Every structure is written in structure tokens, then in C-alpha cells.
Subunit: 219 residues, 4 copies
Amino acid sequence: MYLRITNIVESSFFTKFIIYLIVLNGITMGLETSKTFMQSFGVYTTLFNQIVITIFTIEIILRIYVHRISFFKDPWSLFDFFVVAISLVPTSSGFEILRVLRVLRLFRLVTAVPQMRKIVSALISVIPGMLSVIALMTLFFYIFAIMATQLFGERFPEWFGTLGESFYTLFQVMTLDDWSNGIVRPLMEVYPYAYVFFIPFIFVVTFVMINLVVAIIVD
Amino acid sequence: MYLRITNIVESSFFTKFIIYLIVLNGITMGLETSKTFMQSFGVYTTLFNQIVITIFTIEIILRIYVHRISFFKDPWSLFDFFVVAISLVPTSSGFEILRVLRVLRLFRLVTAVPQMRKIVSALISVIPGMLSVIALMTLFFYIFAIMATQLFGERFPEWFGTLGESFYTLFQVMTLDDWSNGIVRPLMEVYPYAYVFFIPFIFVVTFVMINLVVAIIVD
Amino acid sequence: MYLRITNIVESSFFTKFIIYLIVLNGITMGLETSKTFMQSFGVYTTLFNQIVITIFTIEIILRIYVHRISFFKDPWSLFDFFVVAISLVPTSSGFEILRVLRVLRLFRLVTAVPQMRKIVSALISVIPGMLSVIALMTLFFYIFAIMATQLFGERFPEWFGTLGESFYTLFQVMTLDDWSNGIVRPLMEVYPYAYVFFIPFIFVVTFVMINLVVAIIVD
Amino acid sequence: MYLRITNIVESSFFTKFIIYLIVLNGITMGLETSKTFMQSFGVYTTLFNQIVITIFTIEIILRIYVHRISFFKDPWSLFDFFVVAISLVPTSSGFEILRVLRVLRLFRLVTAVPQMRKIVSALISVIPGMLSVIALMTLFFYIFAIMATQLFGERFPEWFGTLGESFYTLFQVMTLDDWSNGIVRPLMEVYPYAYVFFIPFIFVVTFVMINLVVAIIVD
Ligand SMILES: CCOC(=O)C1=C(COCCN(C)C)NC(C)=C(C(=O)OC)[C@H]1c1ccccc1Br
Ligand SMILES: CCOC(=O)C1=C(COCCN(C)C)NC(C)=C(C(=O)OC)[C@H]1c1ccccc1Br
Ligand SMILES: [Ca+2]
Ligand SMILES: [Ca+2]
């Protein structure tokens, strides 16, 4: 010691205190959606946000002292740091995206409850086996997006004028969402063979993903 | 008479008789849909229904004396109870919801044929493992629906004006329903970076889905 | 009558001739589709048509002599039988539709090639173990069509005006097809609570589907 | 050095070198999609391209003499060959589709990298397994397309006027893309029974599809 409190924080009671708080501020932020609540009780709720934001700043500080540099190879906490930090840049300041960003803290419920922690851990763990198929596909999107841009962006700029648009569109087509009547039929009014681009494209991205799911499943 | 009654409820004719009426009522309920048919034979049917509802009412009565508490620890029968119960209440009474809700008694055909009861049970048995993946997704939806209401509810109130609306819109998107031409493209015209909310959202939401099944298959 | 003919049927000439003809009649049926070809060669192919069915009908008779009672408890032979008898339907205008049912004769390619029959039969083989589920749906879809026609057919006759219409509409939403912006958002404009029919309906119809496949998986 | 040239090629510096040129070109070709960029670097990169093909041209020539008959029985190099050949047409010729086909050379990143090769080589190997199914499906699409064209093309020529269109359309219905409100329901205004073609059509293409994957799964 070193630790004078170290045993707290480690303590079961204290964390669930954070967990009990998180679900509260999470409840607050929900109610903060109602314009009616914010005219009638906005005041109870702004300070409340700050108590919780203070306590959290506190709790994070405490946790770093105990763990010294070893807290910063814990992703969950790294997450807890940046997510609480996020909630600390001011509300009516510069960039209201940051105003919304502070709701990300509600994912701390995952961070503080090992079971969600366990789930998130399970899902990310299938990612490393996939990066190869993720690598091929991204290359393909990159190549076809380019072809689509050069083949169709002059007469159809909304969908294909810029590389990014071809990416966004191809993704849509990839998601198969309103792809015939929505994208290809029109295209085909001007360029009758455009199905020769799109129909194969649809085949490949669909074939691969399917087999991708099989490889996960086959133990 | 305890044994005398018990010997009645268990006969293969009682089961077949109630089942046959179920097959019959279900047919009438189908018949009840034609307003031509109603005009001509409507009266035949409004009464057959209550005749059937009574015979069914008796069956429930008979089965409870025999089983006492063992009738009410059986999930299938409780449902049977609650389904005939709801079929008890009158059309004029309250509002015309129960009047439709009554069609749920056709779920007795599942209730009464042992082959189907097995299928349902097999099916339901898949559910309990999911409560972990179920819960996580629910938190994710809650958080994101909140970010969505604050970001998009002023200019797109119908889709996102409300927590609920943001929930609805999101599931629709989750189902990938006309999500692209229908929602994100419009959003992007006011808020050009809206693809930065939905594309990731779609990823999380589709990946977790895969894994819900993989874990089902693998487990 | 057995001995004379039998020597023709099991031979490689008989089987190869019929099959290669299938491919010929299939090539020939593509062209009938272009009115340009039909105004310039229609008379050639309407009778080329006439000869294959002639060749197929005769072929059916022989195979029946040679196989006797064993012909009509063989499904593939039975199919060709049915698929040919149909192709025997009048050329002239008894009435128009059955005329289109003739292209089914291209399914003789399935019957007559052993690799495809393996596939088809393998496929059909999956059906019996699924049927208990199936029935479940048809009870489920039915209960709901009844509910749907009573709830929505008044203000929305096109989609829910008839039991049969509601079934259709209901099949559509299961396939998840333009289901929200297309169907249920409008419903909600009059009946704000329609999501209580369709969001559950969707979980259920989807739950069953996934689980149908896993049942395929274990088997 | 008709023979001995092999030791220069095949070197670890060699293979990796061609990869670095692919990545630059892959980057510079993305830049070719931009109209702004082409203004102040077009000639710099118009210059860049042909050098790469040339080098590639040089690299393909060297590798052939080293491998002789074997080079042209290497699947990855044949691609290399032809995707280089495409790039070898002149810049300002008659068919501007070829110019666009140039970016196909970014796929050499697949043939030149065994891990890329590993996924692609693995994926294709699945194909021979489905060829019995693919022939089946293509036979099935062909049959229903014929039927569609004779059935709906006169009143709906845009969608069914011709075989190809019916193919496209049928392919569309099969991705279930806007099929109902988009394709079938309109049909039904004129041909009330069209769901009888399409709902069965849907079951079948979905049935074969799902089961195809399960076979992939078990194997
Ligand atoms: C925060 C709880 O979720 C909701 O706010 C909603 C309810 C609350 O009931 C929840 C019923 N639940 C079991 C599906 N109905 C469901 C169903 C919705 C939803 O988005 O479904 C996922 C929304 C809603 C949708 C459409 C119009 C208004 C509103 Br309010
Ligand atoms: C036929 C697609 O239906 C699905 O439910 C699947 C989704 C989509 O379901 C969730 C809702 N969705 C439309 C986003 N992801 C894709 C990619 C799948 C596929 O392999 O077919 C292309 C299947 C699937 C998911 C999980 C486990 C096994 C399978 Br088979
Ligand atoms: Ca759509
Ligand atoms: Ca859709």
C-alpha cells in the first residue's frame, strides 16, 4: 500500500453502485428524448447528469491509481476512459455531435457487467477468422466501385458520380434493397446492358458471404 | 364421482369431439369473413360460436376438477384457459378488440394434438440460450434509438421524432426494409454524413444476427 | 405383348434419342417466344413440336408394356406420364391457358437424366421431416388472415379485404417485401397500433424459418 | 540466355516487387475516378499506367520461357495474362468498355498473393459441388421464363415482353426485390391469378437455395 482503498473498487458493492448509476443516467437520457420532460424537469436532470459525470470521472481516476500503467491495456477501461472523457467536453459547445456522443456511455452497462462483456467478447472473437474474406471483399468493392464510377457516373451522378457514391450504392445493391426497380432498371434505360455488370456482381458478393457463414459454422 | 368424471375427460371421443368442433369453428370463423354469407346465414354462425364456446367452456370446467392444481401447472392448459377465457367476454363489452382476439382459440388445434405440442416445445426450447444475445441487442437498440431521435427527429419527425419511432424505424432498417432508397438516402440530403450512423448500425445488427444462429447451430 | 418391343426401350438409342430431343424441344421452345421468329418460321416449329410429343407419347406406351404394373408406381415415369398427357392437350382453342402448361415438358430433362433425379429426390427427401412445421404455419397464417381481414379490410380492402387477400399480404410481409413503408406505415396512419400485429408476426414467422433450417441441419 | 534466365525471375525480391506495383496502380486508379485529380496529374498517371503494363508485360514474358507449357496450365497466370492483355489495347480505340476493363488488373493482387489465392481457390472448389444444382436452377428459370413471356408480355412488355426480360424479372423476384407491390400486384390488376405462378415460384427457388447451403454446411 500503495492501496488504501484498493480493496474497494475491487469490492462487489462499489461497482454495482456504478452499474446502478449507469442504468439511472441511461434512464435519464431516455426521458431527455421527451420535449415535455425537458420543459418540466430538465433542471433535475442536468445536474443529475453532472453528478453521474463527476462520480464517473472520479471512479476512473481511482481505477488508474490502483492499476498504474496496467489499466491501459484493458480495452474495456480504455473504452471507459474515452467514453467518459467524451461525456466531458461541454454540451452546448462547438459541435453538437459531441452532444450525442455522450450517450455512448450507456454502453458502460456492457463494460461493468461481465455477462455483456462476455457476449461482446464472443462476437468480436469470430472477427479474426473472417479478415481474409473481409480482405477479398473490400478489394472487390474497391475494384467494382471504380468500374461503376467510370461506366455510370456522368449520366447517373446521384448514384455513381464519385467513388464513395459507388461504394454506398453497391453496398445497397449488395444489401439487395430495391436493386432492380430502384437502380438497375433505370440504369438500363440508358445503358441496356448494365445487368451484365450488376447481375454478376450480385452473384459474387452473395456467393462468398454465404460460404463465409458456412466456414464460421463448420467447427 | 371423482373417478367417474376422470374417466369421462380422458376418453378418446371427448378429445376428438372438442377437436372436431375446433376444426368446425375455425371453418365458421373463416366463413364469418364473407359479408354476403353473414347476411344470409350470419345468425347460424353467431350462435354456433357460442354453442361451441360453451361446450369448450364445459371442457375447461371438467378438466380443472380432475386435475385441481395439476391443471394450473401445465403451461399449455393455462393458455387454453386464458384463450377460452378471453373468448368469454362480450362483443358489446369494452371495445371490438376481443372480438378479433377470440380467433386465438384456434391455437387449441395445436394445444390438443400431441404431435404439434412437441414441435412447439422443441421450438420454444431454442429460446432460453438467446436471452443473452437478446438482451445485448435490446440495449444497443435503446442507445441507438436515442441518438437517432436527437439527431433526426426535428427534420424527420415521422421516422425519428420519438424514441418509439426511432425504434420502429430501426427495426425496419434492421430488417433491411426499403432501408436505402427509402430512408438513408433521404436523411443524407439534409444530414450528408448520416451514412456514418446507419452503415455501421447495419453491420452490428447483421453480424450479431449471424452469430445468434451460429451459436444456435453450434450449441 | 412383352417380348418384341422390350428390346427397343431399355436400349441406349431409345433413352439417348428421347433425351437429346428434350434438349432439342427446349432449344425450340426458346424461339417460339420471339414473335419475330414466329412470323418467319412458326410453321416449322409448331410441327417440330408436334413430332416430339408424338415421339414422347408412343415412348410412354411401350415403357408401359415393358414395365407393366411397375410403371404407374414409379414417380419419374409417372411425372413424364403426367407431363406428356398434358402435352397431349388440344392445339386448337378449347381455351388458352393449358397451352402454356406444355413447357413443363422440359422437365423431362429432369426425369431422364440420373444426376438431376438424385438432386431432386435428395431435395424432396428433406420435405417429410419438415411437414409438422408447415402445418403449424398454415394454422398460424390462417389464424392471422382471419384476424387481419377483420382488423384492416374496412379501410384497406386491397391488402386485407378478403381472407385470401390478407393471406397474400401476409405471405409478402413474411418474405419481408416492402413490408414497412409499403404496408404497415400506412396502416399505422389510421390504426397506430398495427405494429402490434406485424412486428410480432414477423418475429414469429422468422423464428420458425430459422428453426426450420436447423431441423434440416441435424437431419 | 534462352534457358538460364529463370534465376533472375522467381526470386523473393521479384514476386513481392510486382505486388508493390499493383498497390500503387490500385491507388493511382482510384485517383482516375476523380475528375478534379485528372486535371493536375492525368498525364503523370497516364504515363504511369503503361509503364506498369509494360513491366507486367515484361514480367509475363520472362515467366513463360521459364515455365513454358506449364505457364498456360497455371490458372492464376492465365488470368495474369489476359488481364494484362486487356490492358494492352490502345488508349483511344473504338470500344471504351475495354478502357474500363483495365482496372480488372487490380485483381492480380488475388493471383499473386497465396493467402488471397487461398480464399479464392477455396471458394471456387465449392462450385463443382453445386453444378448439378445450378444446371437445375437454370433449367427451372428457363422454363418459367418461357411461361412468363407467353403469359404476361403482351400487356406487360417492359417486364415480360421477351425471354431475357422475363429472366431478369424472374431473377428479380427470386432476390425477392420489390416483388409484390413492385411486380406481382400490378400484374394482378390485369391477371388476377398471377400469384399462382409467383408464390409457388418463390417457394421453389427459396427451397433449392436453402437446401443447397445445408449440403455445403454438412460437407
Ligand atoms: C421504448 C419501447 O419501444 C417503443 O417505444 C415502441 C413500442 C412499445 O411496445 C413494444 C412492443 N414490443 C414487444 C415489440 N411499440 C413498438 C413495437 C415499437 C417498435 O419499434 O418495435 C420494435 C415502438 C413504436 C412503433 C411505431 C409507432 C410508434 C411506436 Br411508440
Ligand atoms: C436467406 C437469408 O436469410 C437469413 O436469415 C440470413 C441472414 C440475414 O438474416 C437477418 C435479417 N437480414 C435480412 C439482415 N444473413 C445471411 C448472409 C445469411 C445467408 O447465408 O444467406 C445469404 C442468412 C443466415 C444468417 C445466420 C445464419 C445462417 C444463415 Br443461412
Ligand atoms: Ca423496396
Ligand atoms: Ca423490401
